[PDB]
Amino acid sequence: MKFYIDDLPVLFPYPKIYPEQYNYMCDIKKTLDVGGNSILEMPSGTGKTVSLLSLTIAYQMHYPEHRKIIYCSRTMSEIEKALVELENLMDYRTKELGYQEDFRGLGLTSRKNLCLHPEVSKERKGTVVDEKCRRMTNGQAKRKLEEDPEANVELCEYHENLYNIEVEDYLPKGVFSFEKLLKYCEEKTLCPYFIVRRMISLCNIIIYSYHYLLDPKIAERVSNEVSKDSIVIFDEAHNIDNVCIESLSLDLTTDALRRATRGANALDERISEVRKVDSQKLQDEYEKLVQGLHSADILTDQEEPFVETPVLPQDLLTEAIPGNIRRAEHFVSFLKRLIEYLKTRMKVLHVISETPKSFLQHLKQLTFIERKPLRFCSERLSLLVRTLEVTEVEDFTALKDIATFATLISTYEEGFLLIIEPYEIENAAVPNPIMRFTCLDASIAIKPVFERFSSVIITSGTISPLDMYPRMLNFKTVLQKSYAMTLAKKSFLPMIITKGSDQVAISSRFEIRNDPSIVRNYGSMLVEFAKITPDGMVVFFPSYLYMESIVSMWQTMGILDEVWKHKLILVETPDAQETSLALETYRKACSNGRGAILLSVARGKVSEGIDFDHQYGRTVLMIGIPFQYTESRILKARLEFMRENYRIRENDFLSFDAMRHAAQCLGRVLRGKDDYGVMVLADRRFSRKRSQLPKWIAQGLSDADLNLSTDMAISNTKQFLRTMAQPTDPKDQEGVSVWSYEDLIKHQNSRK
Amino acid sequence: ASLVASIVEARKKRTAKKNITPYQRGIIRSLILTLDCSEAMLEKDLRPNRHAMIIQYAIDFVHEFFDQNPISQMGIIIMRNGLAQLVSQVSGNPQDHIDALKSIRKQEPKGNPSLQNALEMARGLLLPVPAHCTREVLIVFGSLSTTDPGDIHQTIDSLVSEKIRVKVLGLSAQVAICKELCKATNYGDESFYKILLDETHLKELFNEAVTPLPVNKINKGFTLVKMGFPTRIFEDTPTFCSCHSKLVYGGYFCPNCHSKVCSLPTVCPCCDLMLILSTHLARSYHHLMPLKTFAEVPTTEKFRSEDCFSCQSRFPILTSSRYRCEDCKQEFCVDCDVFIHEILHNCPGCESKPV
Amino acid sequence: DSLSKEKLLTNLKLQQSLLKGNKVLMKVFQETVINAGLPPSEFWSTRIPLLRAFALSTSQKVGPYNVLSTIKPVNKVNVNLSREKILNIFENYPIVKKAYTDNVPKNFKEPEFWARFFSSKLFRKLRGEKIMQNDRGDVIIDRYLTLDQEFDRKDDDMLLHPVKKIIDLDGNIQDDPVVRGNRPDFTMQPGVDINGNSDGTVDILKGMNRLSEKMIMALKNEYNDERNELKIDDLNESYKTNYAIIHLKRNAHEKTTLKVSNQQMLQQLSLVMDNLINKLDLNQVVPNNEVSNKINKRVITAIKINAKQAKHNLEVKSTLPIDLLESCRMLHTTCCEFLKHFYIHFQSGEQKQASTVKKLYNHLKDCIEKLNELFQDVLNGDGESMSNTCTAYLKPVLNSITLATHKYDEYFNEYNN
Numbered sequence A: 001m002k003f004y005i006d007d008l009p010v011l012f013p014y015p016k017i018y019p020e021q022y023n024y025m026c027d028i029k030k031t032l033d034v035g036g037n038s039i040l041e042m043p044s045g046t047g048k049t050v051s052l053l054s055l056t057i058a059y060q061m062h063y064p065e066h067r068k069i070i071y072c073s074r075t076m077s078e079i080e081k082a083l084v085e086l087e088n089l090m091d092y093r094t095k096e097l098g099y100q101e102d103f104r105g106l107g108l109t110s111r112k113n114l115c116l117h118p119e120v121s122k123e124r125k126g127t128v129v130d131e132k133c134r135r136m137t138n139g140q141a142k143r144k145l146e147e148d149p150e151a152n153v154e155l156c157e158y159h160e161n162l163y164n165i166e167v168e169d170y171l172p173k174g175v176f177s178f179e180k181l182l183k184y185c186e187e188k189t190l191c192p193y194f195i196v197r198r199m200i201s202l203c204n205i206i207i208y209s210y211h212y213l214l215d216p217k218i219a220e221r222v223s224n225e226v227s228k229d230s231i232v233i234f235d236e237a238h239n240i241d242n243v244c245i246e247s248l249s250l251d252l253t254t255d256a257l258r259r260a261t262r263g264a265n266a267l268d269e270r271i272s273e274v275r276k277v278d279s280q281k282l283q284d285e286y287e288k289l290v291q292g293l294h295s296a297d298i299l300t301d302q303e304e305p306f307v308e309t310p311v312l313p314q315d316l317l318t319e320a321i322p323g324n325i326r327r328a329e330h331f332v333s334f335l336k337r338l339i340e341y342l343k344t345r346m347k348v349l350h351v352i353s354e355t356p357k358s359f360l361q362h363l364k365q366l367t368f369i370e371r372k373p374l375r376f377c378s379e380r381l382s383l384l385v386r387t388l389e390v391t392e393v394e395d396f397t398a399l400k401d402i403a404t405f406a407t408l409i410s411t412y413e414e415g416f417l418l419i420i421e422p423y424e425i426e427n428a429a430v431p432n433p434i435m436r437f438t439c440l441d442a443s444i445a446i447k448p449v450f451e452r453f454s455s456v457i458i459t460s461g462t463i464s465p466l467d468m469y470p471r472m473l474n475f476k477t478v479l480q481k482s483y484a485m486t487l488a489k490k491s492f493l494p495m496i497i498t499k500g501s502d503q504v505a506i507s508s509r510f511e512i513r514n515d516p517s518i519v520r521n522y523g524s525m526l527v528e529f530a531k532i533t534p535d536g537m538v539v540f541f542p543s544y545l546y547m548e549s550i551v552s553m554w555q556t557m558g559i560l561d562e563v564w565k566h567k568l569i570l571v572e573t574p575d576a577q578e579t580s581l582a583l584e585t586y587r588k589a590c591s592n593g594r595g596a597i598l599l600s601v602a603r604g605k606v607s608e609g610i611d612f613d614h615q616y617g618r619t620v621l622m623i624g625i626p627f628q629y630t631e632s633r634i635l636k637a638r639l640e641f642m643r644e645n646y647r648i649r650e651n652d653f654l655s656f657d658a659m660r661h662a663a664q665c666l667g668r669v670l671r672g673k674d675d676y677g678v679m680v681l682a683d684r685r686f687s688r689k690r691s692q693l694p695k696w697i698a699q700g701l702s703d704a705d706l707n708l709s710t711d712m713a714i715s716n717t718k719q720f721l722r723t724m725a726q727p728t729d730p731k732d733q734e735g736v737s738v739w740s741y742e743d744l745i746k747h748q749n750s751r752k
Numbered sequence B: 001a002s003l004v005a006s007i008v009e010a011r012k013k014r015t016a017k018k019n020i021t022p023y024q025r026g027i028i029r030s031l032i033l034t035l036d037c038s039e040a041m042l043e044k045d046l047r048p049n050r051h052a053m054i055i056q057y058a059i060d061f062v063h064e065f066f067d068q069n070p071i072s073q074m075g076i077i078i079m080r081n082g083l084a085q086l087v088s089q090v091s092g093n094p095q096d097h098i099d100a101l102k103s104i105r106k107q108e109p110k111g112n113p114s115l116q117n118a119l120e121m122a123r124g125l126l127l128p129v130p131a132h133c134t135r136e137v138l139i140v141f142g143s144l145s146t147t148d149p150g151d152i153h154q155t156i157d158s159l160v161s162e163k164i165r166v167k168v169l170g171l172s173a174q175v176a177i178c179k180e181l182c183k184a185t186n187y188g189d190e191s192f193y194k195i196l197l198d199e200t201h202l203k204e205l206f207n208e209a210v211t212p213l214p215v216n217k218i219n220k221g222f223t224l225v226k227m228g229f230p231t232r233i234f235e236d237t238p239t240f241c242s243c244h245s246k247l248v249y250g251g252y253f254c255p256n257c258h259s260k261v262c263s264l265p266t267v268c269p270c271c272d273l274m275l276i277l278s279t280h281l282a283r284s285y286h287h288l289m290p291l292k293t294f295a296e297v298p299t300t301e302k303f304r305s306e307d308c309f310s311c312q313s314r315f316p317i318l319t320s321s322r323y324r325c326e327d328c329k330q331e332f333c334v335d336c337d338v339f340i341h342e343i344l345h346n347c348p349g350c351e352s353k354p355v
Numbered sequence C: 001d002s003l004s005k006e007k008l009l010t011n012l013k014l015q016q017s018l019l020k021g022n023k024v025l026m027k028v029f030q031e032t033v034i035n036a037g038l039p040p041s042e043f044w045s046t047r048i049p050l051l052r053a054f055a056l057s058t059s060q061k062v063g064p065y066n067v068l069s070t071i072k073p074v075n076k077v078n079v080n081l082s083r084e085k086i087l088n089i090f091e092n093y094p095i096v097k098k099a100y101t102d103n104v105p106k107n108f109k110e111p112e113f114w115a116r117f118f119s120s121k122l123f124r125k126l127r128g129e130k131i132m133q134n135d136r137g138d139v140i141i142d143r144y145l146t147l148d149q150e151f152d153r154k155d156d157d158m159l160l161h162p163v164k165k166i167i168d169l170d171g172n173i174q175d176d177p178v179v180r181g182n183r184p185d186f187t188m189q190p191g192v193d194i195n196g197n198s199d200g201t202v203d204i205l206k207g208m209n210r211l212s213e214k215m216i217m218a219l220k221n222e223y224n225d226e227r228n229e230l231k232i233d234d235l236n237e238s239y240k241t242n243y244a245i246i247h248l249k250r251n252a253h254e255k256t257t258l259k260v261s262n263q264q265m266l267q268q269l270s271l272v273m274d275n276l277i278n279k280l281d282l283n284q285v286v287p288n289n290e291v292s293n294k295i296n297k298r299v300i301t302a303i304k305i306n307a308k309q310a311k312h313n314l315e316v317k318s319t320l321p322i323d324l325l326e327s328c329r330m331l332h333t334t335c336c337e338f339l340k341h342f343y344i345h346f347q348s349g350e351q352k353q354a355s356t357v358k359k360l361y362n363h364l365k366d367c368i369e370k371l372n373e374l375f376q377d378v379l380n381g382d383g384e385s386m387s388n389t390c391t392a393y394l395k396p397v398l399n400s401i402t403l404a405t406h407k408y409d410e411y412f413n414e415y416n417n
């Protein structure tokens, strides 16, 4: 359906549309015309992404700016689903026009997902895949093979075909799904990793993860070829503060120092071998450090720096390497005594939380190691590894951590704290100690996104409320509001269970978690939903050890054995391969109608992008409040941190963040205006969290449902399944929840 | 507001029944009645038993189907304890099915379902079925799980290849597998998989399910059938029947081999031809031409008559229960209109109207 | 498969088993095949759906299930040992089948055998219970532990295959596998002790999982697409009943092998209105008891014949002896079987069946002579007084037999001559 908005011809692949999506597109168009930022809470039971794609394609083709559009996603599965949605959209628009328009827009992922060389791809670790792909495709391999054809450091045929052909002739114009381009590059023996690394400037739009946005090692590399004036759109980035912190927080082990000593000793022995063959390469490196040439100055673009950038590219140094570490032997001895300092600061007895300034002051007090060499150590080590040709870096890969930490702590001192603890494992036979680094502000990595792009547009599904996100991130929007659906009748059924059918108060606190009476209550609930579950049902808990503890004693006393006769059960395996095979079995079980029951963490891998619908999304349990573990020093420092800066209350934030995780888990049931289910919540303290609930979620929640028990919960689920076990008149939703185009026109005339 | 609620519920029913169309429907039918003795139907949530009201309502359905569709033949497969069983194959005799039903009533139900086994031997029962004889199976299920010896999807595709349409009637709620079964079995339609809410709605589902089903153009079976009536002779001697070899005072003659049979509508056992009467073909002309609904006029207008055209009773005033046949332009009462549409098959107002 | 009419005729052992199950089918079989000489191939050729029903009844098996989770031992535990449960365990667990196949005939007897099998560690281990090292079990079955572990690794190897891409979470975890952040808590790691050894709940989860994939491969035995499953029909056109309507045209033809006028009907209407407004007389209607007597004569003439029919308005009681009665019953039944096969012969419409029609017509002529000598024997042994009953009783089947002979003769003269 091709209709008109105020200035733009807008197409839709369906004959029908929802008003929430329509007004959402209207507000997006207003935000595009005004420029700047916006935060919009969409109703997660509305199809959003296809409307987004239709509006962006129409905006790009008709608007004479023709700004690039940057989709920003979380998971490769989300990227692939968006690829399928866009391919449906462009097929529709090609059929509508009678022709395909010129366009390119693709995804982005790793070599481990993209190495079509069958030998390099077979390695389990993506670090090993990247290392071997470097070793035989880095151009050093090509130069060795060109100099000596007998020099058997080979090249990938998929790599070499991309230089046999041209970069614009890598693909025919259009949009390719990931399986489609993998089939194409298998047919023509092409490397899609280097293809998509060469498609960054060439595609009109882009979609990728958040790691290649935030982590500076993989951030500026994408950010070079993208336009300054592009359109930025996010998706479900409510947990991006965790990703920002984990991109800038590091820990230390005794294994790290041991591996550092071994790598430094083997590196110095190789330096002795290199100086006894030919000191010319090291002399050339030393005079290039005298001149002050960096890794980008000396290395080509194909070869990459060995120690990738720990700090932001805005926080890099441009002057020369100091004379203390300018010589290779002097740098190696300096690194050795740095490891000596790290070892003698490693052996503490109790918990210390010091500043980077305090660490640097004690560093200069004890030894004579300075902040500018600690910044330059990463570049110095990368240039040393490139010159030395030490390609077996298995002993040498640990020193990347030390150079990363040194350049991080010698650049960052405020908004960051250095934590030193004597217990790497608190529940251990022996105390391994640890130094911890803490990222405390999440606005730092999204700051260069803010000053790089004006049209930064932010959205998610269950982001409620909005105000603390311009607190935790130092920004503001020109406009922000939220959206709830104008559904015909309620088909998601939220209620709060504070008590079992025995009327016993229920919770999942980390102290009273091993309370066997409340456990017996919990399994009476498990029995009663296991007896009644038609297709699928999922239970989450705040902590996977506690899941394993309760399911272990459950199997021990046999209620799992007797509920075995109803359905199957799957639990989130530690290996995500086994978890994927488990999801395949559950998909086949709901396909044949046996059905299974799922267990995973509210902060687990299933909770961050996995969808369930119409037999998979049928009902989801949450037992207790999904809190983060309380005695995390990083958590307490961040809690204090955000209170001193943005006056953010600790317990209020903890409750709000637990509700954010719970709402993110519970949003994996409803897709359009056709799915249905019962939303069951099990804690006493849930009743005071309607404000922390999203607007549409708490809209279906009743005040009588704030305190319910298992018996009338069972009753209400029965009358629910009898209710939508029956059909419904289309005329009850013909123009009030679903619109025709004529219904849209009639609403437009009603508004004007 | 009680009459207003009754009027708007009758409007919703009328919107459901607006599609009064003269579709060609399944007349030469072959039926399989899949039943289950599993332990799920032992539950006393239904009073006296799920299996109890299954037995009596199945007896009622047997009687209603043999009345409304006499020429068809219907079989009974019982599921019990991991392997389904056959107690009655397709026959023109209800008595055998009724005796099997009361034998099941006398016995206890217990077990666990194997729907693939039930479908496989149902497939073998419908294997020597002629193309004009439409193949249909009715499904009841009181559980939410089924273990099966092999995969169900090859069975699904094979039964789709065998050109079958099947209704499934579940107990608790909708199951995705049975929804997919009715979808692929019924060319994407999922109106064939329905769940009850109480016993009244259950009986209404039975009364709907007695009726034949309209047939598509794409599965065309346009042919002829070689039919012949028998001749009743009220004979003066105990005489052997062809089937059971027992001495009967009177009976029929075959139109070809002149043999006698006990009952109608039955095939010949000897020269092997379907022997019916005009009653059996006469039973479904109200399917062949239906009776469209009658115009309930409003109380605002003046009326031609203020009393019923048919039962001759005076019409009430707040609402106007004067229901006008569009084929006859005569208003009738709600009582006569409901009775004529449920039982009768001609409008006496249209008999009054000359053409 | 073995589902053709040829294969149903081929399964002679199944025919033997069902014949041995039935009784009157046995008696029919000896009278036709053994006494009269009917070939078996066309004995069973009229019973092909019954053969198919027996073949389906014999050729079916049940769904797999977990024998172990269901069965509890319930102090020597009592056992309701079922051989069906034993074979359920056998083709559930080929390790148990292999432990069976070398122990009953060689090492120890069957009851001491299954006593050791209930005693064994592998019993409670493969049962829904983590194995305890305190348990003594059965040391003979303890040699099967590493054999079953080899079976576990081999089954994992054959089960392992490339995973569908959109479902695969390995692409998600390998999307950015070079992330060096911080590891999660003790919460997210599996349940281990202070020595780091696990409780084995992941191992029993693997075992029940592997049970589910054995169910999946039991379904997946001898006995692109992403676009459709990602397509959504919620905002699409509903399915249309493309059913054809029927219309009627009606023109009934009249049957194949005086008129009053408007003036006449008007004047008779005038007369009858004159008589109606004139007079009605009550007692003029009584008949004169002679015309009423002939009325009674006609009524009683109807009553006599109709009530004589109504005098004769398990079967009826018979004066026949039971031996002669059953002999005429079975001869009648087999002659009906002949005549149904004769309609199979004649309605076949093939020149291929000509010698079959000839030889069967000889058999029918033998049946005719059997009936005639039967009636002669009942005549001379009973003085005809009930042999009249026997002949009148068997009369309609021999009448249709004669009808078949006359049809064969008339058609023979039509096509031959």
Ligand code: SF4
Binding pocket: A111, A114, A115, A116, A117, A120, A121, A132, A133, A134, A137, A156, A157, A158, A159, A191, A192, A193, A194
């Ligand atoms: S060029 Fe591509 S396919 Fe070849 S080794 Fe490198 S990543 Fe693998």
Ligand SMILES: [Zn+2]
Binding pocket: B241, B242, B243, B244, B245, B246, B261, B262
């Ligand atoms: Zn009979």
Ligand SMILES: [Zn+2]
Binding pocket: B254, B255, B256, B257, B258, B259, B268, B269, B270, B271, B272, B273
């Ligand atoms: Zn006949």
Ligand SMILES: [Zn+2]
Binding pocket: B308, B309, B310, B311, B312, B313, B332, B333, B334, B335, B336, B337
């Ligand atoms: Zn009336």
Ligand SMILES: [Zn+2]
Binding pocket: B325, B326, B327, B328, B329, B330, B347, B348, B349, B350
């Ligand atoms: Zn009428």
